[PDB]
Write an enzyme that holds these catalytic residues in place. Structure first.
Site, PDB file in Angstrom:
ATOM      1  N   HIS B  41       0.797  -1.227   0.000  1.00 43.20           N
ATOM      2  CA  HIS B  41       0.000   0.000   0.000  1.00 43.20           C
ATOM      3  C   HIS B  41       0.828   1.275   0.000  1.00 43.20           C
ATOM      4  O   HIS B  41       0.236   2.347  -0.107  1.00 43.20           O
ATOM      5  CB  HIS B  41      -1.051   0.047   1.110  1.00 43.20           C
ATOM      6  CG  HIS B  41      -0.494   0.165   2.495  1.00 43.20           C
ATOM      7  ND1 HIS B  41      -0.191   1.395   3.049  1.00 43.20           N
ATOM      8  CD2 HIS B  41      -0.262  -0.798   3.411  1.00 43.20           C
ATOM      9  CE1 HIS B  41       0.252   1.139   4.269  1.00 43.20           C
ATOM     10  NE2 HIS B  41       0.220  -0.168   4.536  1.00 43.20           N
ATOM     11  N   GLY B 143       2.875   5.918  10.076  1.00 45.55           N
ATOM     12  CA  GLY B 143       4.258   5.786   9.638  1.00 45.55           C
ATOM     13  C   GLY B 143       4.954   4.536  10.143  1.00 45.55           C
ATOM     14  O   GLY B 143       6.099   4.261   9.769  1.00 45.55           O
ATOM     15  N   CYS B 145       3.982   1.572   9.364  1.00 44.71           N
ATOM     16  CA  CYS B 145       3.765   0.519   8.383  1.00 44.71           C
ATOM     17  C   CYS B 145       5.091  -0.010   7.878  1.00 44.71           C
ATOM     18  O   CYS B 145       6.014   0.764   7.702  1.00 44.71           O
ATOM     19  CB  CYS B 145       2.870   1.012   7.258  1.00 44.71           C
ATOM     20  SG  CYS B 145       1.188   1.417   7.796  1.00 44.71           S
TER      21      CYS B 145
HETATM   22  C1  LIG Z   1      -3.400   5.339   7.226  1.00 48.06           C
HETATM   23  O1  LIG Z   1      -2.443   4.451   6.634  1.00 48.06           O
HETATM   24  C2  LIG Z   1      -2.550   3.108   7.096  1.00 48.06           C
HETATM   25  C3  LIG Z   1      -2.664   2.912   8.610  1.00 48.06           C
HETATM   26  O2  LIG Z   1      -3.622   2.305   9.095  1.00 48.06           O
HETATM   27  N1  LIG Z   1      -1.616   3.365   9.330  1.00 48.06           N
HETATM   28  C4  LIG Z   1      -1.354   3.128  10.685  1.00 48.06           C
HETATM   29  C5  LIG Z   1      -0.741   1.970  11.154  1.00 48.06           C
HETATM   30  N2  LIG Z   1      -0.599   1.652  12.446  1.00 48.06           N
HETATM   31  C6  LIG Z   1      -1.061   2.511  13.343  1.00 48.06           C
HETATM   32  C7  LIG Z   1      -1.693   3.735  13.024  1.00 48.06           C
HETATM   33  C8  LIG Z   1      -2.200   4.626  14.001  1.00 48.06           C
HETATM   34  C9  LIG Z   1      -2.841   5.772  13.629  1.00 48.06           C
HETATM   35  C10 LIG Z   1      -3.000   6.089  12.288  1.00 48.06           C
HETATM   36  C11 LIG Z   1      -2.517   5.262  11.315  1.00 48.06           C
HETATM   37  C12 LIG Z   1      -1.847   4.057  11.649  1.00 48.06           C
HETATM   38  C13 LIG Z   1      -3.552   2.265   6.344  1.00 48.06           C
HETATM   39  C14 LIG Z   1      -4.896   2.610   6.307  1.00 48.06           C
HETATM   40  C15 LIG Z   1      -5.814   1.821   5.642  1.00 48.06           C
HETATM   41  C16 LIG Z   1      -5.395   0.669   5.006  1.00 48.06           C
HETATM   42 CL1  LIG Z   1      -6.564  -0.303   4.177  1.00 48.06          CL
HETATM   43  C17 LIG Z   1      -4.057   0.300   5.052  1.00 48.06           C
HETATM   44 CL2  LIG Z   1      -3.533  -1.226   4.418  1.00 48.06          CL
HETATM   45  C18 LIG Z   1      -3.138   1.104   5.701  1.00 48.06           C
END
Ligand SMILES: CO[C@@H](C(=O)Nc1cncc2ccccc12)c1ccc(Cl)c(Cl)c1
Ligand SMILES: CO[C@@H](C(=O)Nc1cncc2ccccc12)c1ccc(Cl)c(Cl)c1
EC number: 3.4.19.12
Lengths: 305, 301
Positions: B41, B143, B145
């Protein structure tokens, strides 16, 4: 989201862990530049430990009595000296993996990561706090002596602890990197007891702020308290006194969450007098006191090393 | 003595953490040999998230669209391929700090260390269990990820997780290092929900054995139970069924402590009915389920 007991990355410290063998004893040593630091009880046998004259025991040792091993490479010891309860084995080779480091002595309540080692090999890393009674509630087995406690400040490893022993209750006692023990402990086999512990009040408040940041708000209430009134209640529940320094250090969290420190104090005062009522805070039924106000900020802000 | 939530030393994984930037997105990548693994992603934009066609988005990408940074050294991407939900960026430099490693897919209940990173820089290490609902209860911010979950058993790093997303409850979903998600999750902004979570019964029993080894015996009882009777009780408290595999796995602890598995099951049954009565087990007022039988034996070595 989420709150975990999080240790500093241990990479910088792993590159310093060596095995120190003196006669029958094998423990861990911290190799920084051309010096290997380890507990001075390595020179002792089960006979010496009862009443040890470390100056005299060390004078009988030669450099070849100490076998220092970094990985599968035997380091040659070219000197040996003692600074308080730590033994400093001067070696011919400077550790190329030596990070930027300082030796810092921490205060009760301050947290640090522990890189548990056995035979100079790091096996686990965990986060713990220096208890107000100067012990650590570590997880250590025989051979973990010489394991170090540390914090990372930007790109600088501040070494603050070296494990020496385990007390009869299962709690641990050790020294700073200058060999000065934390607490009223001595590196000799004698009757030693950890004092009655207290809860790190500033750290409980820091963790309550971390719960608010995570969406846990049930414990919050409309009330505030005087620092004096809070300290009367805290004293009664075996909690450390909360100083004006603690109120100031909790300032950024108070600003971020919108709950004044004395306001959060009233929530803690209620939790102490009434309990959790079957509820949890950050998946815990007890008030957690091993996250400092800085640890909460670092975790809920994502500071990197 | 002492029992702590203990993560594996993260040194071997820190030397692999790089920053992967694709357009506006900046996340973490795992650099092993000449390949950088990161969540696919990273190639997604704002609109290409509800229903992205990753094959089509990656075909529009060139190697110079991906900016990989290891420390302050920009790595040159010479290839890009996709394996399930992971993007594999072939780079021109093999990581000299690459350890002995394997890609392992874990099962619910299995624990692992998480090296949380932001901008390719490790910021913290913590212990996790793969929940029965296939989520992890991590501590992650935006961030994070590309942060990886791992176990380090004898010189070798087994990579078992790569953080991909945070679900609406604050729990996290991710994949193994082959890009296959854990759970019914997808890397799309579609309405996803973690299933109702359960307690890892085998891990609670493993931790009760760790408490006995440490001198905590108050919760022990004169009772034993049938495995069927235990499961009927525990399922009412949202506990995972304890299979014969779990009973076998708990064997060495049962031998070390002298308390049969079905005997410790009755102790857990009692704890479930009574609660702790203001008492703690290993400094905890809740039954801990993120320590596997293997973790207990290793930490009580
Ligand atoms: C927003 O970017 C990603 C995400 O969840 N990041 C985060 C990852 N981990 C913790 C977070 C805490 C707060 C905010 C964002 C966090 C995201 C969003 C939707 C999809 Cl379907 C996918 Cl694969 C990835
Ligand atoms: C045996 O050597 C030390 C020790 O207690 N090591 C340990 C350190 N940590 C955990 C242990 C768990 C089990 C067993 C030994 C553990 C020791 C003994 C007494 C004295 Cl006075 C001193 Cl300074 C050092």
């Amino acid at each position: 989201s989420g709150f975990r007991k999080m240790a500093f990355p241990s990479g910088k410290v792993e590159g310093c862990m060596v095995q120190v063998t003196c006669g029958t004893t094998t423990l861990n040593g911290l190799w920084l530049d051309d010096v290997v630091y380890c507990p001075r009880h390595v020179i002792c046998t089960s006979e010496d430990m009862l009443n040890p004259n470390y100056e005299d025991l060390l004078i009988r040792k030669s450099n070849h009595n100490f076998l220092v091993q970094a990985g599968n490479v035997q380091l040659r010891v070219i000197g040996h000296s003692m600074q308080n309860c730590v033994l400093k084995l001067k070696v011919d080779t400077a550790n190329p993996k030596t990070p930027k480091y300082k030796f810092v002595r921490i205060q009760p309540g301050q947290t640090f990561s522990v890189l548990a080692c056995y035979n100079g090999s790091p096996s686990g890393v965990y986060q713990c706090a220096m208890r107000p009674n100067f012990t650590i509630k570590g997880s250590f087995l025989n051979g973990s002596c010489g394991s170090v406690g540390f914090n990372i400040d930007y790109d600088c490893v501040s070494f603050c602890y070296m494990h020496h022993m385990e007390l009869p209750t299962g709690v641990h006692a050790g020294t700073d990197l200058e060999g000065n023990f934390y607490g009223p402990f001595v590196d000799r086999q004698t009757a030693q007891a950890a004092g009655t512990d207290t809860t790190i009040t500033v750290n409980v408040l820091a963790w309550l702020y971390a719960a608010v940041i995570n969406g846990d708000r049930w414990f919050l209430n409309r009330f505030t308290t005087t620092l004096n009134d809070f300290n009367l209640v805290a004293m009664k529940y075996n909690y450390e006194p909360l100083t004006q320094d603690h109120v100031d250090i909790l300032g950024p969290l108070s600003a971020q969450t919108g709950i004044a420190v004395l306001d959060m104090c009233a929530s803690l005062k209620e939790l102490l007098q009434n309990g959790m009522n079957g509820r949890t805070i950050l998946g815990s039924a007890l008030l957690e006191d091993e996250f400092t106000p800085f640890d909460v900020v670092r975790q809920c802000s994502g500071v990197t090393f």
